[PDB]
Amino acid sequence: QGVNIYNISAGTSVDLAAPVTTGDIVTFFSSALNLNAGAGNPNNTTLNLFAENGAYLLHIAFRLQENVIIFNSRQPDGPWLVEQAVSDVANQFAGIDGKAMVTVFDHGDKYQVVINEKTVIQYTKQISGLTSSLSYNATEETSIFSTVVEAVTYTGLA
């Protein structure tokens, strides 16, 4: 078992030293929380788990203006697949201010997403595979998280 730490500036991605597979965990840590950020176009912030081939295994989109969190997947150079949506952004974060954490458990055929201590969705995968890189995209203006998001992975758990 191992712990890997990464620092992700908004708009960039990182390649993992250890891939995330079934039974593994990834937690994104934000040193800030701005639920009053400007409107998204349409996203304020997105967090993503990528396959080495470029596929979007899991796409987490926070949209304040639409007050919802979208979950989707997408083949390397393909169209976005079936969107799953959880309504009420601020409710998922309630209980903790000025910071936040987003955790994704890889349960084989589903991705469990947890905001702080709250389970937000049991996302049935539309695309399977090993997560080889992670990303955090947003503008320095309308992101709900800090400029740099810390990612910690817990691998080789199974």
Ligand X SMILES: CC(=O)N[C@H]1[C@@H](Oc2ccc([N+](=O)[O-])cc2)O[C@H](CO)[C@H](O)[C@@H]1O[C@@H]1O[C@H](CO)[C@H](O)[C@H](O)[C@H]1O
Residues near its own copies (CB under 8 A) are: 1-5, 23, 25, 27, 96, 101, 103, 105, 107, 112, 114, 116-117, 119, 152, 154, 157
Residue 17, judged by CB atoms within 10 A of its CB (0-12, 13-18, 19+), counts as exposed
Tokens of 88: 């009420």
Residue 59 contacts which entry, its own copies, ligand X, none (Cβ below 5-8 A, type-dependent): ligand X
**Measured from the CB atom, is 80 or 109 closer to ligand X?**
80
Residue 7 marked ligand-binding: no
Residue 117 marked ligand-binding: no
**Measured from the CB atom, is 61 or 89 closer to ligand X?**
61
Distance CA 77, CA 112 (A): 25
Cα angle 18, 22, 23 (rounded to 5 degrees) comes to: 90
Residue 72 marked ligand-binding: yes
> Listing from the earlier edge strand, what are the strands of the sheet with 84-87?
12-20, 131-137, 45-50, 56-63, 68-74, 84-87
Residue 91 marked ligand-binding: no
Stretch of residues binding ligand X (CB under 6 A), selected from 16-24, 40-48, 92-100, 123-131: 40-48
Q: Amino acid identity, residue 139?
A: T
| Interface residues toward ligand X, by CB under 6 A | 42-43, 46, 59, 61, 70, 72, 80, 83
